[PDB]
Amino acid sequence: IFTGSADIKHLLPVETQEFQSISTEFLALMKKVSKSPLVMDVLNIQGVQRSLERLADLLGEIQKALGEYLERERSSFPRFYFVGDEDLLEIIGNSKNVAKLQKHFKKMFAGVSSIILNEDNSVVLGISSREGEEVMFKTPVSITEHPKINEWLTLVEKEMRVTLAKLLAESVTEVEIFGKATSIDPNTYITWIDKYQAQLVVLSAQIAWSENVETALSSMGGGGDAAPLHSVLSNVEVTLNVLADSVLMEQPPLRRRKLEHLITELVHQRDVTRSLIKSKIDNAKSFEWLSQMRFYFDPKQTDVLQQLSIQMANAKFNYGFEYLGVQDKLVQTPLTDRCYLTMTQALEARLGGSPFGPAGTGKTESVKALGHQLGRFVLVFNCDETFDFQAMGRIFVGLCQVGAWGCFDEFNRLEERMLSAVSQQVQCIQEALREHSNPNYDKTSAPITCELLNKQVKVSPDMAIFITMNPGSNLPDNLKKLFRSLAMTKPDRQLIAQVMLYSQGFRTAEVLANKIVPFFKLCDEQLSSQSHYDFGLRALKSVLVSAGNVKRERIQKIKREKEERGEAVDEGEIAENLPEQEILIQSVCETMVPKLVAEDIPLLFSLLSDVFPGVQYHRGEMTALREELKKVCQEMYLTYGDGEEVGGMWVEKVLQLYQITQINHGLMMVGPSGSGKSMAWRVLLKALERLEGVEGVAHIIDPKAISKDHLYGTLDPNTREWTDGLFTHVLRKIIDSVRGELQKRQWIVFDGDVDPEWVENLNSVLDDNKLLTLPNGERLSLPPNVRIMFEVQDLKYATLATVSRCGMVWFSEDVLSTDMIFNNFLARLRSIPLDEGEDEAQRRRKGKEDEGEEAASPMLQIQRDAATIMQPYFTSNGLVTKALEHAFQLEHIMDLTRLRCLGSLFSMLHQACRNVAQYNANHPDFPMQIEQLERYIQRYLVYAILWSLSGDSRLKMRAELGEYIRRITTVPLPTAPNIPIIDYEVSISGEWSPWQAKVPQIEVETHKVAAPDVVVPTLDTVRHEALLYTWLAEHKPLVLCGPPGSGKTMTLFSALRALPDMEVVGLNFSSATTPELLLKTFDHYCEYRRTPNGVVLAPVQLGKWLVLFCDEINLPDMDKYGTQRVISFIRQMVEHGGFYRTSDQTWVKLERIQFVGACNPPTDPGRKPLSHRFLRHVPVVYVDYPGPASLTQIYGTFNRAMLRLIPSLRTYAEPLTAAMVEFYTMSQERFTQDTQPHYIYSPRE
Amino acid sequence: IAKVQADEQFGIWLDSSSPEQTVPYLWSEETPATPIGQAIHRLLLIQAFRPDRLLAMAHMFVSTNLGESFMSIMEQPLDLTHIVGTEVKPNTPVLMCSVPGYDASGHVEDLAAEQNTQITSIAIGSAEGFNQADKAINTAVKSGRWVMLKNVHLAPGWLMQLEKKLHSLQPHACFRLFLTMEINPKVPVNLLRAGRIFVFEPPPGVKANMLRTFSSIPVSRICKSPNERARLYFLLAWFHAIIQERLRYAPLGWSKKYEFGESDLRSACDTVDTWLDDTAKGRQNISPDKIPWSALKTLMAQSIYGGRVDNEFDQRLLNTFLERLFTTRSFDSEFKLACKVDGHKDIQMPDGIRREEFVQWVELLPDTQTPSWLGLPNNAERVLLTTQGVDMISKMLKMQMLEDEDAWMRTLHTTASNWLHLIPQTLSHLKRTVENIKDPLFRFFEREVKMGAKLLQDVRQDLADVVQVCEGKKKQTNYLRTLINELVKGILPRSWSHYTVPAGMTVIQWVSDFSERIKQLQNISLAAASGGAKELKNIHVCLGGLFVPEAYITATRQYVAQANSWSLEELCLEVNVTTSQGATLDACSFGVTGLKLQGATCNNNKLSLSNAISTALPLTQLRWVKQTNTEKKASVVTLPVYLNFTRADLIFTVDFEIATKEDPRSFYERGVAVLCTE
């Protein structure tokens, strides 16, 4: 406190001097301790105990003095009780730096977001709201004459109230003319609306209507003549017509809000006057008029807090002239009228209020509206894991002292300790309030008090407390007697929709409201329940506002179209002849369909057709963007369609993504894995690059791979220095714009699972504030160029707070058909040389078509011919499609995803054409003929189909798939009866050949009979190393699963070490393994080198491919939100080809790094399933047990080695080896894990 | 059965008011039975024929076994003097628990006055009260004084601390500690275990309720001018009685048990005082017309008592009561507080004007109160008793085998075997296609079949495991052991409840409803498979047998809208009750069965008030028609259609025409309704 602020010296000089003399002594003592940090040496310091007791006493005294001073400052200006200790110290310390105070007014005042100041900051001229609405003081507050912060802040509050009352007087005086006029000139009415604030405008309208109705009812006076009320209704309807005409025009936003508020108030006034006329009310003291809220303005009152009196039945409140800004008004439904009546009755009886009901029924908003109608500062306290208790006593004292309301939203959600403590505090406050009501207590001298924070706090009468509740339930037993409860079970959807649609200028609102309201409930019931769906009233109101915006856009479109021609223009005439239902259904579809799952979209359209018959939503045509999408899709080897074609849904989804990016500043793609969301976003960025001539930059971050501290940057607990996190570093880089980043357009994409923990800081940015706040105290303003994006497989663990702020496009799995992926594969084959690597990757963009480069290499020709051979089998009903559909029926240990199988198959076909190229290189005198090429690739396609689809399944199911392929295929297969098709290899020549020919029979030394880590060649081993080489040629991350002891680790190590280039690093994963293990391994074997392209991680050994063995990929523990950190880290490495150095907060790229894993099946207890965004990249093989033939071969080799010691028993080698196998197999058949958990057998035995 | 058929005098017994005293001899005996044998046989017969009298019959069984005066001592005023003097030790606190809204400290004060013993009373409502109570107890434990702590349920943790303190003391002989509380579950279990519990309840009746209300109100408040005020208070008191006693007869009296407590009464009195002070302005008299009746009706309909009411139908009932009572005609000497009491008699307003006249009129009321005082039908009492009757037997089922541990698995094996045999083995899933998915009915029935099949597999697996445990094949796991604990006692396990059902249901009713629901699901699935979705319209669906019949109503509305190309908003519902066999259904008409009509009989599609508890509605045609601009006829009543007898969930509402010139308000006071299932 005493060095952070330099002005504290002037406020508290004596305490400053005492703290100086204390700090010197304490520093000396700490130096002495530092020179001898032993406990016993410290204890023997001369007089340490008495010195420390003196220091404790004096520090306690100075802290007491500081607390008393801050409490005095709080009591001088009571609104500071809503401000924390550090914030109040900042406010007082920066008394001369007024700009720093500007951020704290939103906590103290209801609407004042800042204070307008003279250029020298010596006089306060007025106040301003969040929306920019300003109230200019009639008499400015001179800071120079009142230098103390509390004094001129109190004067600012006083002048706010005085000027609001004085402007309300003029507003009422001006609107009285419109009240008594048969016709209202629209220009004068709009000028009056502009001249005065929204709050005073609505108050003036209400005051005029109340006074006119009062004068009318006085004039009728028992004669039964209803003409004056008819005149009042006529004037109200004339004003409504004027406002309806004015709101269809194009208006500034503030004036539009004022017009909307006036319409919402005047509809209620019209309804009340119609009710009075229908009931034939003929006396001002009849209850039908008294039960309606009434406004009595007495300009002659000298005091400015008892001029406007708001009355409802018994209750007679005064308007506290607290500036509220442009608040959101509430459609005064009969339920809200009941709420107002009961709540004002409770306030008149000094009881508390308890509107209880289901969620989203307007309870807290109705209480807020009631408090704002009377001008009293409302302060809603949320009760969902953000309940700041340590300020709650301070907040209660502030409410009591200043006079202000407090509403607890969902008070049930407080935990039992929290509930009981707050219940006791509110009970004491309510008893203090109820003490007012007694008549014997004369209020000439009545200082009411309550026991709060062990002090007697004076309670003002204007204060009140409200407790919203959610049944299922009852209020705490302390407050059951003191609180009046009201059942807000079911709000009036129809009338709210009616009033809002009428406010937007719709000619027909009754029919539209009565249609749209049941439609939303129909969608809520019929559609499959999902977390992201939101058919509550907030969504409905937002949809109706969007419909109004679309209507106004159509008016402007027709107006400008006619103006470019020769025509006479009138806004009302254009608005008359339009379909309102088309606008409303368009808004509903545009707001809902992006969120809709593919299963639910036809149900939604059926419901929409039912509710809105004969009305259809034609999608707005974007010709330019669609042409750019076509260009980029052909450039990136992607299919494009014009809707209802192959790829129409994907084009529609990227268009919806463009729409949501245009609307919102934050959005998500929440499809399943392998639906094209990341590809769609990339295509959209590269298409807007051409369309708008603005450079698209992407910053892709995996948030769960990196820790939150590194992500957002952490403050050093000592030796204060700020280290920017990765996200904060990116934001600061774009904000500074050293390389002109403001000119460019940049999108940040959080490509990883969303969790509550790492999105707390991002909530402020994603909200309308658009401000990142850090523990450093810096406030980064998000510029308009930034668009924070999300990719998630699902939002299972995403908070509703995060989902609400962001737009969303659900990329259902049936947006990317199999035909699209096959077309992508065949297009990549025909134009990407398969051997040239990455040096020619840049040259792909040099040529827009690469003319004259058809024969880039013989590899291109060979793979083009291979694609020609392979095209008939990749059709929409070809061999591959039927095989995949059948394979999806088969159970696999790992979850069978479409793109995993397809990527495996594509890699195998890549290796097929590579093998053809190898044969051509080895036969330069006569290369591969097209007949041999046809036979070879036809057989290889079947072989790869088997090993990609049934490569994860048992041997019996591999045989099943082989039988199905044999049924449906035209390619010849092996003609040996009792051999599975998987046992055969495809030779370089087209004909098949058994694998058994390629497995040698070796002899093992007696030295290493049981530890030949070089695997004895068996049929499974040769198959699996062949597949290992095929899938390592493409650098795909191989994974092998199987039961324990099957032999996956040995086969992996032997196959990897057989290669000359591969440098194996053996890492074993555990439950506590993290990204830190992989980073440490890279630091060990690899190194970072700077290049013009960027920072590159590479192995130290040149020309060697570093491959990481992850022996147990499954075993790392999932977080609380079901994600393995290391798996996501490996996923981002293999998919993006790099990762972010957190220390430097910079992107680095892997150059010669690979991953190859082993696993047990996820059914085993210690294991977990892998993320589907990760399993897509890895091809998984199932290493089952060797079986009788392989075991006989392996242990024939071992026993022939073992019997070499004794030369008379060599002849008994083979008979023994069968026995060791046979009995073992018999045991494996007789004893299973079902009988006992430990009856497990493997070749380890 | 044959004896019942042959008995000519059976009907007079069956309609008798006290059948239990004269049960006929029907059981066959090889030897003459003992008196207790006759008692238990009569108990079985009364359970079979007249369950509403079962409790009374049960009392006779007790009188047949444990003496006539056995139960009588409880039907008496509580004699706390001898009990606290002799049967209570000084260290055992006297816990006086009361139902909410009732205070029992007056009993302790009266006892302290009678015994001439100084008593210190402290109200625990704040942290200070704990210190005062500790000081008072530390003084009295040494000096042997009497201590009373009022409303201690507000402090559970401090009550635990007090129990721990009490375990360590060495109190004086004359020391006594009374703790008055309201019955809540937050009181510590150990304190209840280590204390003498006395349960206090208010005496049921309108008479006692009005007497308590008049005693609670100060005399000066009612005696204040103008003279009319007291009469209003009487009406208010009567009103507060009528709503309160009616809560006994829930779900018939009210849709749910609201907390109409004394706070509402004080708020109403304050409202009346404020409005009469405003209107009279000190006049000694004001005419009955000048009383602001509209203000009182609106405020006690929306602010005082209506705030707690969430159901719209209970709000309508409250409006009917307030409009019937609070009116100028209340000041006429001929006003009737309750019409057709017992169907023949009426209750007249007192003709006095002072408080004493009304108090005397209340004191002179008859002691014999029927439901007709509150507007309910007399057989409502016959309903309430049989509910309590079931509440007896089920409670005894929760006592049958936790005390008794001898054979319980021998019978549970047979019970679970029968339950497995009852439930069908499987529920075939519907075959979704492109054509039938457009049908809303197929979507609804597919969702229903999915939920039913899942829950069916759950229950079948649980029962199979239970039978395996009873045979010794399977060991008792924790979940399984809890399941046997629930099933043996007849409690419905939480693991089985995944659709809305009545609370407190035994397991046999649940599995029987299960069998009916699954049979309905099988029938509709077979119909869909055979004739496609087109047969889903012509099938007569029991809304009771659906897990969410509101979805069925919405689906029928959607089907009519799709067929006739009308908007959903423009369709309105009408009901036709047809007794004719083979009544053809129109294209917009859907059949329903299993509906029950509580409190009325439907003849010629017209309602008439009836004394029958429930009447089975025949095939009911729900017809959707374009909403014509038809004026709401005065002879039209908007009944609800509740899901089941608890009336917790409302499916929709039905407009019915009234056969006679009966007031529609009588249907609201009578609580007439419709239930999808009994």
Ligand SMILES: Nc1ncnc2c1ncn2[C@@H]1O[C@H](COP(=O)(O)OP(=O)(O)NP(=O)(O)O)[C@@H](O)[C@H]1O
């Ligand atoms: N072809 C083979 N030649 C020789 N030994 C083999 C062969 N196949 C399996 N084995 C034996 O099988 C056992 C298992 O070896 P190992 O590769 O460690 O299994 P593992 O699946 O990696 N165990 P784990 O990593 O925990 O799943 C060893 O005793 C090997 O010697």
Ligand SMILES: Nc1ncnc2c1ncn2[C@@H]1O[C@H](COP(=O)(O)OP(=O)(O)OP(=O)(O)O)[C@@H](O)[C@H]1O
């Ligand atoms: N428009 C398209 N036409 C053809 N193929 C496409 C198209 N979009 C995507 N694909 C194919 O689908 C694959 C998956 O798409 P994308 O790279 O966007 O991944 P994703 O759906 O975000 O999946 P993941 O969960 O693995 O990140 C792409 O690699 C490409 O093979």
Ligand SMILES: Nc1ncnc2c1ncn2[C@@H]1O[C@H](COP(=O)(O)OP(=O)(O)O)[C@@H](O)[C@H]1O
């Ligand atoms: N009568 C009404 N008029 C206008 N808007 C309403 C009305 N009732 C509810 N709403 C809207 O519905 C939303 C309900 O949220 P809120 O009142 O904040 O919490 P809850 O309703 O869950 O207590 C509000 O944002 C409000 O704008």
Ligand SMILES: [Mg+2]
């Ligand atoms: Mg992606």
